[PDB]
RNA sequence: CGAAAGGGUCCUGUAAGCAGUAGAGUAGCCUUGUUGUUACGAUCUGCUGAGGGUAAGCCCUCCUUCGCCUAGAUUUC
């Protein structure tokens, strides 16, 4: 009986009472950023084998124009206004 | 380094427990019973040089004093300061108690 | 019969479970499993091993002071058997278990109160440092949206928002490498 | 109902296929299990693995194969003249945040 | 799997199921000791060919408790509710 | 039926990262000491019975997804 009296007293005092879209948006954006960081780290892990061999320098490999155009497109750069086709060697 | 580390956990290689050492420090009667379960002529230094905290006999007073500066003795002191684990602490961990009327 | 509790970890010790160590001072040590038994024989302190009820009580992660915990005890003074007393005792145990569960959930929420504010602060810091990694439209997509807006007399910003919504809906992963065409 | 040319992304649980395997054979066995998985999934006996997929399998040495790996299998047409099989599968490694918790999904053709 | 002195309402199947068998959802026979088969194996039960000569055949069995903890490890809980009551609230419980 | 996934059950033992008037002390800047302050610093505490694994001879899932199907070949009083 004492336990039940304490229980109803706590229920009157709100001991068991249980309780923002901007916060939800900023949390979703942070989760997206963490996913992008994980993808970048996975790309680095795929590219690097520095225990056994050194990475070929970037200046010794000719980058493909299609890949450069695609990457600048995903970065949001208008490539037709700058004309990468004339810049590409043959 | 531990002598013969492979068989260190055997019951025939068991050492005195920390709560027993705590009771030895609190009560000289408990320590007296434990020392009665041994033979004095087979002990290092005829049993005259004893560290209660480490529950260990030593060959000489200088050996005991030199042992006190080492880290095993200081680890035993830190463990005794923290307090040995007992059945009372085990009961309090689950919130169980003894009703004696 | 009765349910004991493990000396080392505090788990329920049902019959035929674990092992008992009989010490020569006259003290018995019941262990629920060989894990607890071997940690005891290695002289590990349960108060420092984080998976034990001893550690959790010492760290204050268990509900310790509470009225519902005063009903179970080791009764050293027996009571004469009474059928009505035993039945109302069973009803009491059921009610006490429900109340204890509710109070334990409240206790845990009080422990985990501040997580939302900490996570929001971390999210704001991460976004402020990495605004450039947020999703964006392609340059060719901006071209086609601009010319469609010019043709339809609509808002290019509006077409940008619904295109960003479609890109957020459609999630596509990138595959490493690529096939080399045979000669 | 399903066309010959089709690509799907799968999670391969290599842990249960490499359980108890000799250490010097764990990664080649992983290569063979990936080929067997692709043959079972697409019906094609001719399976070709991407070199980046091989690097991903061999990333942690001969006995450090990941428990799970996300792959894309693309059933494509064998256009070469005098080919024994009309179809083949090409298997690539997929860049994902975490290979756990993903279902088999059809890759959009566009 | 309940007795007269154990009032827990529970079935015979251990927590997590019988290892490499599944769940017992039908009528079952509890036999003292061990029998020649393995798990999943068909077992033939037969009436004894002769009238018994021991008091053990005449004894009536009075069970107090049947173990239903997990046999996939050192199971310490007879029921999922008992496991949750001992465990307390987990992180995933508030996450859900 | 198969491959995933989810839930359960077990195993280990509290992830990465961030924070802290916790931290033996040391060195700078000034209010020259009044957590003076800032910096570093094994470790400790919190987020966190968390993280990781789980059938490969564990369990459940018409009602969580994707795929497969009435073959082919050989032989038979
Ligand atoms: Zn000492
Ligand atoms: Zn235990």
XYZ file of C-alpha atoms (C1' of nucleotides) and ligand atoms in Angstrom:
659
model
C 0.000 0.000 0.000
C 2.875 2.382 0.762
C 4.403 1.520 -2.621
C 1.113 2.267 -4.390
C 0.750 5.579 -2.528
C 4.281 6.530 -3.579
C 3.437 5.500 -7.151
C 0.324 7.678 -7.376
C 2.197 10.558 -5.724
C 4.950 10.299 -8.349
C 2.341 10.073 -11.113
C 0.753 13.286 -9.831
C 4.164 14.967 -9.655
C 4.938 13.886 -13.221
C 7.815 11.515 -12.487
C 6.777 9.264 -15.391
C 5.889 12.120 -17.765
C 7.663 11.852 -21.123
C 8.548 14.817 -23.334
C 12.767 20.440 -33.954
C 12.909 20.296 -37.747
C 15.964 22.573 -37.914
C 17.861 20.206 -35.616
C 16.654 17.243 -37.681
C 17.870 18.950 -40.866
C 21.303 19.745 -39.411
C 21.615 16.166 -38.111
C 20.722 14.725 -41.523
C 23.263 17.034 -43.178
C 25.942 15.934 -40.699
C 25.116 12.289 -41.448
C 25.462 12.977 -45.181
C 28.841 14.632 -44.564
C 30.021 11.634 -42.515
C 28.988 9.305 -45.346
C 30.948 11.419 -47.853
C 34.003 11.325 -45.574
C 33.723 7.532 -45.337
C 33.576 7.255 -49.137
C 36.668 9.480 -49.471
C 38.577 7.338 -46.963
C 37.572 4.193 -48.868
C 38.854 5.733 -52.115
C 42.151 6.534 -50.391
C 42.377 2.967 -49.062
C 41.777 1.604 -52.564
C 44.406 3.917 -54.057
C 47.172 3.474 -51.442
C 49.512 0.474 -51.093
C 52.381 2.364 -49.478
C 53.610 -0.617 -47.439
C 54.781 -2.456 -50.573
C 55.227 0.204 -53.264
C 55.141 3.942 -53.843
C 52.295 5.724 -55.603
C 53.059 6.754 -59.190
C 53.256 10.577 -59.315
C 50.211 12.278 -60.804
C 52.314 14.235 -63.305
C 53.479 10.996 -64.974
C 49.939 9.834 -65.837
C 47.771 11.590 -68.401
C 44.324 12.140 -66.928
C 41.395 11.252 -69.225
C 39.282 14.177 -70.399
C 36.035 12.276 -69.807
C 36.972 11.611 -66.172
C 38.067 15.219 -65.606
C 34.838 16.522 -67.165
C 32.743 14.128 -65.073
C 34.477 15.145 -61.837
C 34.104 18.861 -62.562
C 30.444 18.245 -63.423
C 29.792 16.612 -60.046
C 31.657 19.531 -58.465
C 29.154 21.756 -60.258
C 31.456 23.504 -62.720
C 30.121 24.450 -66.147
C 32.788 22.906 -68.361
C 31.396 24.105 -71.693
C 31.974 27.747 -70.764
C 35.675 27.003 -70.185
C 36.239 24.560 -73.059
C 38.182 21.553 -71.794
C 38.045 19.958 -75.263
C 40.527 22.462 -76.692
C 42.708 22.004 -73.602
C 42.895 18.223 -74.011
C 45.929 16.998 -75.934
C 45.818 14.215 -78.518
C 58.735 -12.541 -14.293
C 56.562 -15.336 -12.905
C 58.185 -18.670 -12.097
C 56.562 -21.490 -14.117
C 53.848 -19.317 -15.639
C 52.177 -22.249 -17.447
C 50.783 -23.857 -14.274
C 50.212 -20.563 -12.434
C 46.417 -20.960 -12.246
C 46.503 -24.459 -10.730
C 44.885 -24.853 -7.318
C 48.163 -26.243 -5.968
C 49.779 -22.903 -6.957
C 47.106 -20.735 -5.296
C 48.042 -17.630 -3.290
C 46.305 -15.901 -0.387
C 43.328 -13.722 -1.295
C 42.998 -9.972 -0.814
C 39.972 -10.153 1.496
C 41.857 -12.646 3.662
C 44.763 -10.184 3.748
C 42.313 -7.427 4.751
C 41.012 -9.570 7.612
C 44.629 -10.327 8.567
C 45.382 -6.602 8.782
C 42.240 -5.892 10.808
C 42.475 -8.840 13.230
C 45.687 -10.439 14.564
C 43.751 -13.599 15.488
C 42.996 -14.330 11.813
C 46.673 -13.861 10.928
C 47.632 -16.079 13.871
C 45.462 -18.943 12.587
C 46.953 -18.549 9.106
C 50.482 -18.650 10.529
C 49.528 -21.659 12.662
C 48.707 -23.529 9.454
C 52.449 -23.284 8.558
C 55.715 -24.606 10.009
C 58.143 -21.981 11.287
C 61.336 -23.939 10.599
C 60.469 -24.290 6.891
C 59.854 -20.565 6.389
C 62.374 -18.018 5.076
C 64.224 -16.380 7.950
C 62.448 -18.733 10.406
C 59.252 -16.753 9.790
C 60.628 -13.622 11.459
C 60.271 -11.348 8.391
C 56.727 -11.258 7.056
C 54.826 -8.806 4.861
C 51.120 -9.057 5.665
C 49.958 -7.010 2.664
C 51.780 -9.247 0.176
C 51.310 -12.338 2.426
C 54.961 -13.182 1.921
C 57.944 -14.346 3.956
C 61.432 -12.953 3.399
C 64.900 -14.183 4.280
C 66.029 -11.029 6.100
C 64.962 -7.633 7.392
C 66.974 -5.897 4.665
C 65.216 -8.085 2.083
C 61.807 -7.081 3.485
C 62.730 -3.377 3.559
C 64.045 -3.548 0.000
C 60.875 -5.315 -1.126
C 58.745 -2.486 0.296
C 60.167 -0.053 -2.286
C 59.102 -2.201 -5.233
C 55.948 -1.788 -7.296
C 54.305 -5.160 -6.350
C 54.125 -3.988 -2.729
C 52.774 -0.631 -3.899
C 50.199 -2.401 -6.084
C 49.071 -4.394 -3.048
C 48.826 -1.164 -1.034
C 46.748 0.479 -3.778
C 44.451 -2.563 -3.960
C 43.971 -2.551 -0.183
C 43.264 1.191 -0.279
C 40.634 0.580 -2.961
C 39.188 -2.234 -0.855
C 38.835 -5.965 -1.390
C 35.756 -7.411 -3.062
C 33.530 -9.271 -0.598
C 30.185 -11.046 -0.406
C 28.688 -7.893 1.126
C 29.750 -5.862 -1.918
C 28.441 -8.636 -4.178
C 25.049 -8.517 -2.440
C 24.920 -4.717 -2.597
C 25.750 -4.836 -6.318
C 22.429 -6.584 -7.019
C 20.562 -4.778 -4.256
C 20.011 -7.925 -2.190
C 20.047 -7.795 1.607
C 19.875 -10.055 4.657
C 16.773 -9.940 6.860
C 17.589 -11.108 10.397
C 14.334 -9.994 12.018
C 15.186 -24.866 -4.763
C 16.203 -21.243 -5.320
C 18.047 -18.975 -7.733
C 21.443 -17.945 -6.441
C 23.540 -15.097 -7.789
C 27.060 -15.189 -9.155
C 29.683 -13.883 -6.748
C 31.747 -12.354 -9.547
C 29.240 -10.905 -12.020
C 25.878 -11.019 -10.218
C 23.992 -12.966 -12.910
C 21.256 -15.430 -11.889
C 22.772 -18.796 -10.973
C 20.243 -21.533 -11.688
C 20.789 -25.137 -10.499
C 23.680 -27.118 -12.055
C 25.170 -23.903 -13.467
C 28.721 -22.838 -12.786
C 30.960 -24.028 -9.989
C 31.513 -23.420 -6.275
C 34.897 -22.754 -4.687
C 35.171 -23.843 -1.046
C 37.803 -21.800 0.775
C 39.540 -23.111 3.893
C 38.429 -20.161 6.016
C 34.863 -21.450 5.626
C 33.602 -19.212 2.803
C 31.846 -20.469 -0.330
C 32.085 -18.723 -3.704
C 29.433 -19.515 -6.310
C 30.208 -18.728 -9.955
C 27.672 -18.870 -12.758
C 30.225 -19.818 -15.435
C 33.836 -20.667 -16.177
C 34.439 -17.090 -17.381
C 33.775 -15.692 -13.903
C 35.561 -18.655 -12.303
C 38.745 -18.131 -14.332
C 38.751 -14.372 -13.749
C 38.455 -15.085 -10.012
C 41.334 -17.594 -10.175
C 43.357 -14.934 -11.995
C 42.480 -12.562 -9.099
C 40.785 -9.954 -11.266
C 38.704 -7.431 -9.329
C 35.029 -7.527 -10.431
C 34.707 -3.841 -9.520
C 37.103 -2.958 -12.361
C 35.731 -5.318 -15.037
C 33.081 -3.252 -16.786
C 30.782 -6.167 -17.659
C 29.895 -6.914 -14.023
C 27.101 -5.692 -11.781
C 29.788 -4.773 -9.231
C 31.332 -2.294 -11.676
C 27.930 -0.957 -12.687
C 26.887 -0.370 -9.071
C 30.246 1.269 -8.309
C 29.935 3.547 -11.357
C 26.335 4.419 -10.518
C 24.699 2.984 -13.636
C 22.306 0.752 -11.665
C 19.269 1.968 -9.751
C 20.518 1.647 -6.164
C 18.198 3.675 -3.952
C 14.575 2.812 -4.760
C 11.622 1.583 -2.739
C 10.943 -1.405 -5.007
C 14.337 -2.931 -4.123
C 13.449 -3.334 -0.430
C 11.022 -6.225 -0.965
C 13.509 -9.021 -1.756
C 15.793 -10.219 1.033
C 17.378 -13.313 2.532
C 14.799 -14.227 5.174
C 16.602 -15.778 8.135
C 13.442 -15.870 10.295
C 10.928 -18.303 8.749
C 7.193 -17.655 8.541
C 4.572 -20.374 9.002
C 3.026 -21.383 5.690
C -0.212 -19.605 4.778
C -1.878 -20.127 1.403
C -3.448 -16.655 1.236
C -0.162 -15.018 2.234
C 1.683 -16.899 -0.517
C -0.910 -15.975 -3.168
C -0.926 -12.282 -2.254
C 2.879 -12.437 -2.179
C 2.859 -13.692 -5.788
C 0.545 -10.844 -6.813
C 2.875 -8.433 -5.006
C 5.935 -9.709 -6.912
C 4.155 -9.167 -10.237
C 3.148 -5.595 -9.327
C 6.612 -4.798 -7.918
C 8.283 -6.046 -11.103
C 6.143 -3.749 -13.272
C 6.806 -0.691 -11.081
C 10.542 -1.439 -10.908
C 10.733 -1.700 -14.706
C 9.064 1.707 -15.129
C 11.352 3.380 -12.592
C 14.424 1.788 -14.183
C 13.489 3.210 -17.586
C 13.124 6.671 -16.010
C 16.550 6.247 -14.356
C 18.189 5.344 -17.681
C 16.632 8.328 -19.470
C 17.938 10.598 -16.706
C 21.395 9.152 -17.378
C 21.122 9.786 -21.146
C 19.487 13.262 -20.998
C 22.223 15.433 -22.576
C 22.945 13.413 -25.713
C 20.662 15.417 -28.009
C 22.330 18.756 -27.261
C 25.804 17.229 -27.604
C 24.915 15.651 -30.966
C 23.345 18.872 -32.278
C 26.469 20.860 -31.356
C 28.693 18.287 -33.090
C 26.439 18.332 -36.169
C 26.578 22.129 -36.419
C 30.376 22.137 -36.136
C 30.732 19.419 -38.794
C 28.366 21.142 -41.240
C 30.078 24.513 -40.747
C 33.445 22.923 -41.514
C 32.144 20.917 -44.505
C 29.524 23.013 -46.326
C 31.224 22.172 -49.645
C 30.364 18.450 -49.381
C 26.587 18.978 -49.215
C 24.611 17.671 -52.226
C 24.586 19.934 -55.268
C 23.421 19.906 -58.867
C 25.683 19.191 -61.818
C 26.752 21.968 -64.160
C 24.991 20.271 -67.067
C 21.920 19.877 -64.846
C 22.014 23.608 -64.095
C 22.280 24.266 -67.845
C 19.253 22.130 -68.677
C 17.248 23.585 -65.779
C 18.108 27.129 -66.880
C 17.034 26.502 -70.471
C 13.844 24.738 -69.332
C 13.083 27.706 -67.066
C 13.688 30.086 -69.977
C 11.386 28.023 -72.205
C 8.576 27.568 -69.664
C 8.794 30.994 -67.993
C 9.274 29.344 -64.602
C 11.628 29.846 -61.678
C 15.058 28.280 -62.222
C 15.497 28.219 -58.437
C 12.247 26.255 -58.177
C 13.374 23.696 -60.766
C 16.662 23.491 -58.849
C 14.825 22.623 -55.627
C 12.699 19.855 -57.152
C 15.749 18.492 -58.990
C 17.658 18.439 -55.692
C 14.677 16.645 -54.131
C 14.766 14.008 -56.887
C 18.527 13.595 -56.421
C 18.026 13.211 -52.666
C 15.369 10.564 -53.309
C 17.531 8.624 -55.790
C 20.594 7.244 -53.981
C 23.245 5.664 -56.220
C 26.564 4.140 -55.188
C 29.792 4.294 -57.175
C 31.627 1.168 -58.323
C 35.412 0.933 -58.444
C 37.232 0.256 -61.677
C 35.658 -0.638 -64.989
C 35.885 -3.241 -67.733
C 38.682 -3.080 -70.309
C 37.351 -3.596 -73.829
C 38.897 -6.558 -75.633
C 40.502 -6.047 -79.035
C 10.629 -10.995 -67.293
C 14.252 -10.045 -66.634
C 16.342 -9.023 -69.637
C 19.721 -10.549 -70.442
C 21.614 -7.317 -69.708
C 21.066 -6.482 -66.035
C 23.120 -5.211 -63.093
C 22.498 -5.806 -59.389
C 24.318 -4.910 -56.183
C 24.760 -7.677 -53.614
C 26.320 -8.194 -50.211
C 28.460 -11.347 -50.139
C 29.007 -12.896 -46.702
C 32.507 -14.274 -47.226
C 33.007 -15.041 -43.522
C 30.783 -18.132 -43.550
C 32.382 -19.315 -46.807
C 35.934 -18.904 -45.481
C 35.280 -20.357 -42.002
C 38.011 -22.872 -41.189
C 40.020 -22.391 -44.392
C 43.822 -22.726 -44.441
C 45.489 -19.338 -44.069
C 47.633 -19.571 -47.207
C 44.502 -20.397 -49.224
C 41.908 -18.015 -47.717
C 42.195 -15.197 -50.280
C 42.342 -17.401 -53.442
C 39.386 -19.312 -52.012
C 37.647 -15.949 -51.591
C 38.257 -15.247 -55.292
C 36.791 -18.636 -56.227
C 33.802 -18.148 -53.895
C 33.072 -14.765 -55.481
C 33.152 -16.428 -58.912
C 30.844 -19.216 -57.694
C 28.465 -16.647 -56.166
C 28.321 -14.718 -59.438
C 27.699 -17.901 -61.425
C 24.861 -18.876 -59.078
C 23.343 -15.380 -59.095
C 23.421 -14.671 -62.841
C 23.473 -18.147 -64.391
C 26.679 -17.323 -66.286
C 29.698 -19.618 -66.179
C 31.942 -16.846 -67.566
C 32.661 -14.461 -64.684
C 35.262 -11.689 -64.865
C 36.503 -9.876 -61.760
C 37.618 -6.269 -61.657
C 41.257 -5.729 -60.596
C 40.071 -3.255 -57.951
C 37.848 -6.051 -56.631
C 40.942 -8.274 -56.496
C 42.792 -5.513 -54.623
C 39.882 -5.199 -52.180
C 39.967 -8.952 -51.519
C 43.760 -8.932 -51.060
C 43.762 -5.648 -49.086
C 44.809 -7.171 -45.745
C 47.081 -9.941 -46.999
C 46.440 -13.563 -47.835
C 44.439 -14.287 -44.644
C 42.769 -10.938 -43.939
C 39.715 -11.180 -46.204
C 36.774 -8.966 -45.108
C 33.749 -10.673 -43.597
C 31.376 -8.870 -45.974
C 31.856 -7.111 -49.294
C 29.481 -5.091 -51.467
C 29.689 -5.956 -55.163
C 27.975 -5.020 -58.409
C 27.411 -7.878 -60.854
C 26.563 -6.890 -64.430
C 25.284 -9.558 -66.786
C 26.279 -8.368 -70.265
C 26.288 -9.738 -73.799
C 29.368 -11.471 -75.216
C 29.665 -9.762 -78.601
C 32.798 -11.619 -79.737
C 32.410 -13.989 -82.670
C 32.687 -17.696 -81.947
C 32.010 -17.324 -78.220
C 30.926 -20.422 -76.302
C 28.621 -18.432 -74.000
C 26.361 -15.603 -75.135
C 26.445 -13.882 -71.726
C 29.019 -13.116 -69.046
C 29.142 -11.378 -65.681
C 31.482 -8.563 -64.654
C 31.944 -8.102 -60.904
C 33.095 -4.791 -59.413
C 33.667 -3.557 -55.879
C 31.236 -0.869 -54.706
C 32.252 2.170 -52.657
C 29.856 2.195 -49.683
C 30.096 3.588 -46.167
C 29.407 0.228 -44.524
C 28.813 -3.124 -46.280
C 26.451 -4.172 -43.458
C 22.719 -3.564 -43.504
C 22.142 -3.511 -47.269
C 19.699 -5.430 -49.444
C 20.124 -6.722 -52.971
C 19.245 -3.856 -55.290
C 18.839 -3.438 -59.043
C 21.206 -0.829 -60.488
C 19.461 1.675 -62.757
C 20.476 1.297 -66.399
C 20.777 5.068 -66.858
C 7.505 -26.523 -18.981
C 5.854 -25.118 -15.845
C 5.632 -27.097 -12.606
C 3.597 -26.783 -9.420
C 6.384 -24.913 -7.608
C 7.636 -22.950 -10.650
C 4.791 -20.739 -11.846
C 6.667 -19.233 -14.796
C 4.470 -19.706 -17.866
C 6.960 -21.079 -20.368
C 7.356 -23.734 -23.041
C 9.933 -26.509 -23.293
C 12.038 -24.834 -25.990
C 15.229 -23.195 -24.657
C 15.952 -19.534 -25.280
C 17.171 -19.109 -28.839
C 15.728 -22.504 -29.784
C 17.136 -25.997 -29.559
C 20.607 -25.894 -31.114
C 20.495 -27.383 -34.647
C 16.846 -28.451 -34.187
C 14.474 -25.499 -33.827
C 11.407 -25.165 -31.631
C 9.239 -27.908 -30.145
C 5.654 -26.892 -30.939
C 3.993 -30.313 -30.613
C 3.442 -32.836 -27.862
C 6.756 -33.982 -26.444
C 8.135 -36.770 -24.279
C 10.694 -36.071 -21.560
C 12.898 -39.118 -20.968
C 15.324 -39.418 -18.078
C 18.911 -39.731 -19.255
C 20.255 -40.196 -22.770
C 19.002 -42.180 -25.773
C 20.956 -43.652 -28.762
C 20.052 -41.051 -31.416
C 21.276 -37.582 -32.342
C 19.332 -34.386 -32.919
C 16.795 -34.515 -35.818
C 16.942 -38.329 -35.814
C 13.824 -40.489 -35.947
C 13.401 -42.355 -32.662
C 11.249 -45.425 -32.080
C 9.648 -45.721 -28.645
C 8.512 -49.192 -27.637
C 6.644 -50.707 -24.730
C 8.867 -52.790 -22.472
C 8.734 -56.483 -23.332
C 8.493 -57.725 -19.733
C 6.865 -56.725 -16.472
C 9.290 -54.567 -14.518
C 11.118 -55.721 -11.391
C 12.431 -52.414 -10.007
C 10.954 -49.793 -7.700
C 12.138 -47.097 -10.131
C 9.492 -48.194 -12.633
C 6.891 -47.839 -9.880
C 8.036 -44.391 -8.706
C 5.972 -41.347 -9.650
C 7.970 -38.351 -10.859
C 7.529 -34.933 -9.235
C 9.267 -32.182 -11.209
C 10.099 -28.892 -9.511
C 11.781 -26.999 -12.353
C 12.686 -27.460 -16.014
C 15.668 -25.590 -17.441
C 14.826 -23.413 -20.452
C 17.944 -21.258 -20.646
C 19.949 -21.065 -23.852
C 22.079 -24.066 -24.762
C 23.971 -21.946 -27.329
C 26.250 -20.773 -24.519
C 26.208 -20.153 -20.781
C 22.580 -19.093 -20.643
C 21.581 -17.544 -17.320
C 17.998 -16.538 -18.179
C 14.973 -18.790 -18.457
C 12.846 -16.231 -20.338
C 13.352 -13.130 -22.460
C 11.481 -11.074 -19.858
C 13.893 -12.322 -17.186
C 16.837 -11.330 -19.390
C 15.395 -7.841 -19.928
C 14.623 -7.405 -16.217
C 18.183 -8.310 -15.225
C 19.712 -6.284 -18.067
C 17.814 -3.025 -17.753
C 17.258 -0.501 -20.503
C 19.665 -0.663 -23.444
C 20.751 2.013 -25.911
C 18.667 0.493 -28.716
C 15.554 0.594 -26.509
C 15.626 4.395 -26.432
C 16.793 4.387 -30.054
C 13.564 2.572 -30.961
C 14.701 -23.290 -52.787
C 18.747 -19.712 -52.714
C 21.120 -14.915 -51.531
C 20.639 -10.689 -48.428
C 18.364 -8.256 -44.305
C 15.677 -7.860 -39.656
C 14.609 -9.951 -34.909
C 16.377 -13.510 -31.205
C 20.260 -16.307 -28.840
C 25.183 -16.605 -27.690
C 30.934 -14.499 -27.448
C 34.083 -10.570 -26.060
C 34.318 -6.422 -22.883
C 32.992 -0.543 -23.328
C 34.461 1.307 -30.413
C 36.079 5.728 -33.314
C 35.666 10.697 -32.024
C 34.682 14.752 -28.987
C 34.547 16.912 -24.155
C 35.937 17.571 -18.810
C 37.666 23.316 -12.540
C 39.857 14.616 -13.100
C 45.400 14.082 -13.833
C 51.947 13.362 -11.045
C 54.474 17.487 -12.896
C 57.052 20.816 -16.352
C 57.472 25.394 -19.499
C 55.741 30.020 -21.186
C 52.395 34.885 -20.889
C 50.765 38.351 -17.729
C 46.562 40.097 -12.943
C 52.797 37.565 -10.400
C 49.125 34.107 -8.480
C 44.108 34.443 -5.584
C 41.259 26.327 -9.882
C 46.412 32.992 -11.939
C 46.087 31.599 -17.011
C 47.565 28.920 -21.283
C 50.381 24.703 -23.562
C 51.963 19.365 -23.167
C 50.857 15.113 -20.260
C 50.702 7.850 -19.227
C 46.064 7.624 -17.357
C 40.790 8.641 -15.550
C 35.549 9.997 -16.202
C 31.043 10.710 -19.718
C 28.587 10.006 -24.213
C 28.942 3.727 -24.036
C 26.860 -3.650 -21.365
C 29.086 0.347 -25.982
C 31.498 -1.353 -30.604
C 32.666 -5.850 -33.148
C 31.216 -11.041 -34.382
C 27.152 -14.579 -34.664
C 26.637 -20.820 -38.686
C 30.287 -21.717 -41.527
C 26.867 -28.517 -38.509
C 22.440 -21.837 -33.836
C 16.890 -20.328 -33.965
C 12.583 -17.478 -36.087
C 10.468 -14.378 -40.351
C 3.575 -16.401 -46.578
C 2.658 -10.909 -43.747
C 11.523 -7.336 -44.946
C 13.626 -7.490 -50.047
C 15.932 -9.661 -54.640
C 16.375 -13.961 -57.620
C 15.198 -19.268 -59.350
C 11.284 -23.097 -61.260
C 7.242 -28.009 -64.450
C 14.642 -28.962 -66.777
C 18.984 -31.367 -69.606
C 21.304 -36.212 -70.284
C 21.409 -41.665 -69.575
C 18.927 -46.203 -68.563
C 14.865 -49.658 -67.529
C 11.092 -57.165 -66.812
Zn 54.831 -6.343 0.596
Zn 29.092 -14.876 -13.240
